[PDB]
Structure formats: structure tokens, C-alpha cells
């Protein structure tokens, strides 16, 4: 049967695709061939001339040249150009010691979703990444229920017009379709921000993106359940018009974990790695100086070497304070 | 030379169905019929070779399944001569393949003569048919003659197709369109639902015409043209409804 199914599946044949370049009339479609040029085509059947619209992904006919099926679109490498992840890895707390942005963001992000009574326009992360900063965005995403969608910067502007928008508007399209969706626009001075001279470097492609979001944000595209986490290390590298409400409702400092900020993150990010009680908890934290949430984990992990090296899966004080010094040797 | 091909439209449509869906492939398989005296290419039937994942070839022909059928067909009482070759040639007026020829040519051997039926299943669907059958050589001719004895006969060289069925299926065909009473009067007495449109449609006619008439003050759009064809289309369709009431 299985092979027979295949044996049968071979009867079955491939089916042309288009995304409607437009609907002239309910039936009448310009669908530029998703493989090729524009065509005057009709519906076929199981066809909702309703759903049928410009851009609507559709299976098309080799002969009848019309709909062989209506198709759910993916217009954009939703995991590549767009990058989508449902919620986030950790909730707020593990990077605790960043706690300032643990709470305050959630009440300006997660709650006003569940508390639609403005909707948040944007939320701008800045400060050192990977202090839990890297984790903060997903901490936001985790608690909400949204799909976290990572947006890198440079790649969204291809040298062409609206590729940005196209990439971005699928971040609008898919996500607002896939909502709730966290959008996360990664450290964006490339396709956004204040550009080069604000002249043309392709800056006009960049201004586009800058304006695309603007036309999405200061444009009437809202974030209903699809939320957008802005990313930068420093906020001032960005469009001030972006910094305005209607685009940015939040501008997020993300400092280092404090000593206790480390200590909390420490016994979170480190002590969760298999460790002794002998593993020297605060002396690490004390030897921990300005360690980010990861550089905290380095207290664990740089000692995971010495764990591995002391023949430990369980980090030991010997493992540990070698690490935390090692984590505090190369930096503060 | 003027040669009489005869098709079972069954086999015709059978092929079509097979051919219509056959795109891309040229559909392949038997051609069941005979030759009544000369000229006479009869077709009762035909059938798919099963898909050729090797595509149409002199090779991809399997005479197993035919016999299987032909037996079951013989069992069916179904029996004919395999009269030639019919395939689905997307966007092909042209000619099918010298292969297909050679394919046939290998095969028309098995007959006095055979065909290779050109079909563009694409161009078939047009509401008219697109099709041909080659068998490229003659006896002499309608007896053409010279190029054979002079050797080097190659060309399209169609045959002359025809077919016949009956008034029988014709009915059963024209049966296309309890019944009428249920099917007709009364079944489309729905009008009044649209009276507004039926008005408005008629309403719109009016304007178009003051317009049209006006130009009287060259070539078509002419002041006294679409007028009738317009106010004449809403006249009847509006009278048929009266039959119901």
C-alpha cells in the first residue's frame, strides 16, 4: 500500500503556482506567473473569489492556466529574512537582575495586549546585548503568547525597492496573520536609523525601510497581538521620528547585571549548571564584576571547562573561581 | 490519399480525457478499429498506455496490458485491430516525433498501416478540436507515389480524419442540456429576485443610447447600433418570466 501509494502518487502530477498579481473581476485575474510573466486568468473551483485577491498565493493550471487551488502564502523566508519563533525561550526572571526591564516592559507589552485599554506602538531595547538583553526580547515573547519574530537589519534592504517592505510587510502580513507575534528588529542601524548622510547610499532604500516601518508604525498598521521588539545597543543611533510615539512607545535600557543583579542571575544562570554547594556562590559573584547574563553563565561555563577539566559535570569551587576570574580577567 | 478515418468519439473523448489530463505527456496506447476495404480507418476504441515514466517511446509501449485488457476486452467482447497511435502534443501542430513516426513506423508494420494521432490537449480544449493523424508513406497514393520510390519520404503527412457514432448516444449526448418540469420553467422562474436589476439593467440601457443616438451629429459605436442589441436583450428575458405568472 505504502509503495502503492507512491506507485499511485506518481499518477499525481505537479501543479503550477501563482500569487495573484491582481483580481480584475471576481474571476478575472492578473496573476503574474509565480514562475513567469503576467496572465489573464480566471478562477476554477473550490475557489473563493472572495479570498482571491492580488498577491493571493494560488495553485495554477498547466493548461486551463487558471486556479488549480488557492494557496496559503509564504512570501518571505519567514525563518530567514524574517525569523519567527513562537514566544520566547525563557520567561522574564532567569536574567533577573535586569529586573528593571523584566517588569516594566511586561506591563507596557504583555499586559496592554491583554489590556487593550494606546496599544503599544514599539518597544526599543538598548544596552549591552546578551546580559539577558538577548534573552529579554524572548523573555518578553515567552510570557505573552505571541510568536517572536526576529528581524535582522541589513538583509531586509536588497538593492531594489520595497524588498524591505516586502520582507517587512510579510513581517506585517504573516505575523499580523500569525498574531500574536513578537517582532524583533535586530540592532537596526542598517536598514533603519539615521543612515549615512541621510542622502543616497542606497540610504533611500534604507530611508524606505525607515519609512516603511514609519508607514507601518506612524502608518495605521497597528500591533494588535503582533508586537514589535526594537533592538539596538544604543538607542540614539536611530531615527528620532522613530523614537516618537506612534512608533516607539518604549525605549529600553538594558544595563549589566549588578553584583546582586549578577548574584541573582548568577545563582540562576550559573548555579543551574550542575554545581556543588562547594562551588563558591558569591565569591564568584564577588569575583563577578560587570558580568552579563551570559558572562554570568561563563562563571558556570568557563568553569564548565574546569568542570570538564577537574573531571566535573558539577561545577566546583575549583572550577568556579578560576572561571569568574577568567570571566573578569578579560574585562571588568 | 484521401483516406477515411473513423473514430469512436468514446475513444476520442477517452483519449481526450486521458489526453486532457495527460499534459504534459503525450498520452499513449492502443487504437482499436480496423480498415474496411481501403481508406477506412475505423476506431471503436483506444486506451492509455499506463503512465510512461520513460515518456512516449517505441519502448514505453507495453503490449502486456493490452492483452490483459484485450483478453478482458475479448472477455468484454471488445476486440479490434490496433490501428495506430494517438498522443497529446502540447502546443504542437508541427509533427509528433520522427521517433513517434519510427515508433508508429515500427508499428504500422503490425498493420497494413496505422496512424499517429496528433493531439494538442491544450489546443484541444478550445471548444473546437485540435488533432491529426500521420502515417507517412503511401501505397502509391490514392493511387504519394514518387518520393517513396525516390526514397526519402518525410513530412508531416496527415491522414484524413473522420468518425461516426449514432443518433443513439446523440440523444444521450444531447441529454446534456421529472426533468424539464422540474428542470425548466420553474427552475429559472427566478427573475423577480432581480427585478431591481431587471429594472436597473433595463434602466441602464436608456442612458447608453441618448449617448449613442447623439453621435448622429466615421465608424462603429454608431448612434443607432448597440441601441437595439441593448434594449432588445432585456425585452425577451423579461417576457419569459411572464410564462410563470
Amino acid at each position: 500500500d505504502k509503495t502503492e501509494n507512491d506507485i499511485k502518487a506518481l499518477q499525481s502530477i505537479g501543479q503550477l503556482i501563482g500569487e495573484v498579481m491582481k483580481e480584475l473581476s471576481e474571476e478575472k485575474y492578473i496573476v503574474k506567473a509565480s514562475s513567469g510573466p503576467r496572465y489573464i486568468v480566471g478562477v476554477r473551483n473550490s475557489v473563493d473569489r472572495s479570498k482571491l485577491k492580488k498577491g493571493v498565493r494560488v495553485t495554477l493550471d498547466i493548461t486551463t492556466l487558471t486556479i488549480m487551488r488557492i494557496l496559503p502564502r509564504e512570501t518571505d523566508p519567514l525563518v530567514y529574512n524574517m525569523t519567527s519563533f513562537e514566544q520566547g525561550e525563557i520567561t522574564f526572571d532567569g536574567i533577573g537582575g535586569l529586573t528593571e526591564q523584566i517588569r516594566e516592559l511586561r506591563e507596557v507589552i504583555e499586559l496592554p495586549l491583554k489590556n487593550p485599554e494606546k496599544p503599544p506602538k514599539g518597544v526599543l531595547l538598548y544596552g549591552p546585548p546578551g546580559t539577558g538583553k538577548t534573552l529579554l526580547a524572548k523573555a518578553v515573547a515567552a510570557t505573552i503568547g505571541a510568536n517572536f519574530i526576529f528581524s535582522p537589519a541589513s538583509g531586509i534592504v536588497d538593492k531594489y525597492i520595497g524588498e524591505s517592505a516586502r520582507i517587512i510587510r510579510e513581517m506585517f502580513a504573516y505575523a499580523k496573520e500569525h498574531e500574536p507575534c513578537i517582532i524583533f528588529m535586530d540592532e537596526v542601524d542598517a536598514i533603519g536609523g539615521r543612515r549615512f548622510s541621510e542622502g543616497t547610499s542606497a540610504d533611500r532604500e534604507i530611508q524606505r525601510t525607515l519609512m516603511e516601518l514609519l508607514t507601518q508604525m506612524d502608518g495605521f498598521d497597528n500591533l494588535g497581538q503582533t508586537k514589535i521588539i526594537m533592538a539596538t545597543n544604543r538607542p540614539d543611533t536611530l531615527d528620532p521620528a522613530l523614537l516618537r510615539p506612534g512608533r516607539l512607545d518604549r525605549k529600553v535600557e538594558i544595563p549589566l547585571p549588578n553584583e546582586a543583579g549578577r548574584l541573582e542571575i548568577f545563582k540562576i544562570h550559573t548555579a543551574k549548571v550542575k554545581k556543588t554547594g562547594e562551588f563558591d556562590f558569591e565569591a564568584a559573584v564577588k569575583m563577578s564584576d560587570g558580568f552579563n547574563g551570559a558572562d554570568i553563565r561563563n562563571c558556570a561555563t568557563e568553569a564548565g571547562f574546569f568542570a570538564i577539566r577537574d573531571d566535573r559535570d558539577h561545577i566546583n569551587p575549583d572550577d568556579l573561581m578560576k572561571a569568574v576570574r577568567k570571566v573578569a580577567e578579560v574585562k571588568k | 490519399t484521401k483516406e477515411t478515418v473513423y473514430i469512436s468519439s468514446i475513444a476520442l473523448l477517452k483519449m481526450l480525457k486521458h489526453g486532457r489530463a495527460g499534459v504534459p505527456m503525450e498520452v499513449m496506447g492502443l487504437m482499436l478499429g480496423e480498415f474496411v476495404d481501403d481508406y477506412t480507418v475505423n476506431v471503436v476504441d483506444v486506451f492509455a498506455m499506463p503512465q510512461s515514466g520513460t515518456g512516449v517511446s517505441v519502448e514505453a509501449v507495453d503490449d502486456v496490458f493490452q492483452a490483459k485488457m484485450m483478453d478482458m476486452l475479448k472477455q468484454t467482447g471488445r476486440d479490434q485491430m490496433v490501428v495506430g497511435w494517438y498522443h497529446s502534443h502540447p502546443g504542437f501542430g508541427c509533427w509528433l516525433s520522427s521517433v513517434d513516426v519510427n515508433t508508429q513506423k515500427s508499428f504500422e508494420q503490425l498493420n497494413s498501416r496505422a496512424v499517429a494521432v496528433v493531439v494538442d490537449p491544450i489546443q484541444s480544449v478550445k471548444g473546437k478540436v485540435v488533432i491529426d493523424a500521420f502515417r507517412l508513406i503511401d501505397t502509391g497514393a490514392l493511387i504519394n507515389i514518387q518520393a517513396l520510390i525516390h526514397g526519402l519520404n518525410r513530412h508531416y503527412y496527415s491522414l484524413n480524419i473522420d468518425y461516426h457514432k449514432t443518433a443513439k448516444e446523440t440523444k444521450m449526448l444531447m441529454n446534456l442540456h421529472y426533468e424539464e418540469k422540474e428542470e425548466s420553467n420553474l427552475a429559472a422562474t427566478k427573475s423577480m429576485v432581480k427585478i431591481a436589476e431587471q429594472y436597473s439593467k433595463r434602466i441602464e440601457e436608456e442612458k447608453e443610447l441618448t449617448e449613442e443616438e447623439l453621435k448622429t451629429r466615421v465608424g462603429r459605436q454608431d448612434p443607432k447600433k448597440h441601441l437595439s442589441e441593448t434594449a432588445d436583450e432585456t425585452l425577451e428575458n423579461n417576457i419569459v418570466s411572464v410564462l410563470t405568472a
Binding site: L10, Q15, S34, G36, T59, E74 | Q51, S52
Partner: peptide, 28 residues
């Protein structure tokens, strides 16, 4: 019958509903 040619044009999947796939050729 079926197999194979040297080579085919290859293509890249989108959907994998559960039985559904679209691909776009090495002929695009």
C-alpha cells in the same frame, strides 16, 4: 518507467495540508 534523468532541475519546497508541497524549479 519513472526513474531517472541526469539531472533534473531541482526546486525548493514551501509547504510540507500535511500532504502538500510547492517547489520552485532550478528553472525558477
Amino acid at each position: 518507467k519513472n526513474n531517472r534523468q541526469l539531472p533534473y532541475l531541482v526546486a525548493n519546497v514551501v509547504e510540507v495540508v500535511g500532504k502538500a508541497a510547492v517547489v520552485k524549479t532550478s528553472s525558477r
